[PDB]
Amino acid sequence: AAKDVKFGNDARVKMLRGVNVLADAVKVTLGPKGRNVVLDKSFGAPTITKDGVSVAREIELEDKFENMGAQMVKEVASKANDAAGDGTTTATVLAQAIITEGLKAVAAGMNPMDLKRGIDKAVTAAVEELKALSVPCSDSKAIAQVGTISANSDETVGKLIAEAMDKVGKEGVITVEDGTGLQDELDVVEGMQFDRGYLSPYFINKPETGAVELESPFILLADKKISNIREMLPVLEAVAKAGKPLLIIAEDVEGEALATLVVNTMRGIVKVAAVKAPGFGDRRKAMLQDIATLTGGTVISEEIGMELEKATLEDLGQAKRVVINKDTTTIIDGVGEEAAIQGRVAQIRQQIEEATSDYDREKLQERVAKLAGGVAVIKVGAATEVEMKEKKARVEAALHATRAAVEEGVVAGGGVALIRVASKLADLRGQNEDQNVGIKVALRAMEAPLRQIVLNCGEEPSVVANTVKGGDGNYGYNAATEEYGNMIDMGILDPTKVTRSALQYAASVAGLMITTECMVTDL
């Protein structure tokens, strides 16, 4: 029908305003200062967002345009957030600065394309500089500091991350679970995780993450792939004479062969999940066996000649809970048998030694390793359930950031890298003036987040920024110290990856926002 059109600046402004609103909350929240943000929920009690990210999520704009603009930033921010594990706010902050400048440039009427290109070019240059700048991660104490950064002055999270990290080992994966109680618990977990996808997003559970968690799942393992429903059905009868979420492991499902019959034919009332059996070939079988032992269930294979129909519920193992993500499917804890698990591990271990070949050894060793799992679980307590969820999310983000940060090594925090790079970046020129301005804009954007921290300090960011820029090498401002010192010496370092990730995303967002001169909507 009729469209309400806003031209250029008009289109931009809606996004910009939305961006600003979202950004403002985020910026203040970013850094230790932001205590909290809260807003209502349509259903249920209103959500409260401790984190900057959560704030962005929480914040919705009444205006469609503004909201959409806000959403765009958030979505990018989240993506950066996931990968980096941290720097969600930073990306948002960066984006806002870039966007605003871009918009102004838009006001200038310089073709945004050059600017975008310039920005991208600047980003690339900055990235390169950052990479060189970045240095190896410091020790666990640093790690805690890294954790704290993700923490946003959540001391506990950093401590937990460090503590979990120490026990597990940096290499060892750490998993987070909701705390049993207010006090956190760190437990080594028994179980194995195998990287398998979820066959269909349909399987994908309710939660936003889309990882599916089953409570007291039942595990049916078949070495053979599950061709059709019918074979499955007798299992199902045991299972629809069941209910708490059944997990099914099949070597393969033809999303052709299984899916049509299963979905239509099968009520699927009981929760069901399907995963491909880990590994392939004998190894796959071996993995299945390992899983089966861990589950405590039994596996049925054609070679065995056991029938799925014949197999009862008992054959199916149970898990305390299972979490599945597209990348990987894990069982938090199979009931298993303590002896059984150990025995299998030993047997596999013996096998590992036994096999002459490295390859054989590797498969076995991998298998054994999985069984122990080396997994650590972290529980987060909270005053309230809501808090716990919030805390947990923060913790998870921190963990990812920390892990990434350590491997990458950590660049000086405080946006020191960003400021430092920008200066170098400034010298570089874009192909054309429009590009040049964009490049400058990007540089400006980088500078801003340093200022924001300063603003939180209440110190005038101009002086700090100037001083920071002036200092060669790694120079930065420590909010807590409110003294000038080497970032490395300070030991507060922001992860290279997180910084890089955030910057890239922010730049991308900004460019996108910049590009759309005009927006059209239905009236």
Known binding residues are 29-32, 50, 86-90, 414, 478-480, 494
Instruction: From 41-49, 84-92, 180-188, 271-279, give the range in contact with Mg ion by CB under 5 A.
Output: 84-92
Would residue 167 be called left, alpha or beta, if left means φ above 0 and alpha means ψ between -120 and 50 degrees?
A: alpha
Structure tokens at 193: 């995780």
Q: Residue 457 is which amino acid?
A: C
C-beta of 139: minimal distance to ligand ATP in Å?
Answer: 17
Q: Burial, 494: exposed, middle or buried (Cβ in 10 Å; 0-12, 13-18, 19+)? A: buried
Residue 189 near which of Mg ion, its own copies, ligand ATP, none (CB within 5-8 Å, type-dependent):
none
- Contact set for Mg ion, span 143-162 (CB under 5 A): 150
How far apart are the C-alpha atoms of 128 and 160, rounded to whole Å?
33
Dist. CA 155–CA 157, nearest whole Å: 6
Q: What, of its own copies, Mg ion, ligand ATP, none, does residue 523 touch, CB below 5 to 8 Å by kind?
A: its own copies
Amino acid type, 141: K
User: Among residues 26 and 253, whose Cβ is nearest to Mg ion?
Assistant: 26
Residue 345 contacts by C-beta under 8 Å, 6 or more apart in sequence?
A: 368, 371, 372
**CB 288 to its own copies: min, Å:** 21
The one-letter amino acid code at 282 reads D
Instruction: Annotate each residue in 384-413 with x if it binds ligand ATP (CB under 6 A) or - if it does not, as one string.
Output: -----------------------------x
Strands 193-194 and 272-276: what pairing? unpaired
Q: Tell me whether strands 321-324 and 37-38 are parallel, antiparallel or unpaired.
A: unpaired
Which member of 58, 60, 66, 86 binds Mg ion (CB under 5 A)?
86
* Residue ranges at the known binding site for ATP: 29-32, 50, 86-90, 414, 478-480, 494
Give the x-and-dash track for 459-498 against ligand ATP (CB under 6 A): -------------------xxx-----------x-x----
Three state DSSP letters for 309-375: CCCCCCCCEEECEEEECCCCEEECCECCCHHHHHHHHHHHHHHHHHCCCHHHHHHHHHHHHHHHCCC
494 is a contact residue toward Mg ion (CB under 5 A):
no
In the block, residue with structure tokens 């269930």: 297
Nearer to ligand ATP, 56 or 294 (CB): 56
Q: Name the segment binding Mg ion (CB under 5 A); options: 78-86, 177-185, 246-254, 308-316.
A: 78-86
Which of ligand ATP, its own copies, Mg ion, none does residue 479 bind to, with CB < 5 to 8 Å depending on kind? ligand ATP
453, 479 Cβ separation under 8 angstroms: yes
List the single partner that 447 binds among its own copies, Mg ion, ligand ATP, none, CB under 5 to 8 Å by kind: none
Q: By the criterion CB under 6 A, which residues form the site for ligand ATP?
A: 30-32, 51-53, 81, 86-90, 148-150, 152-153, 413-415, 453, 478-480, 492, 494
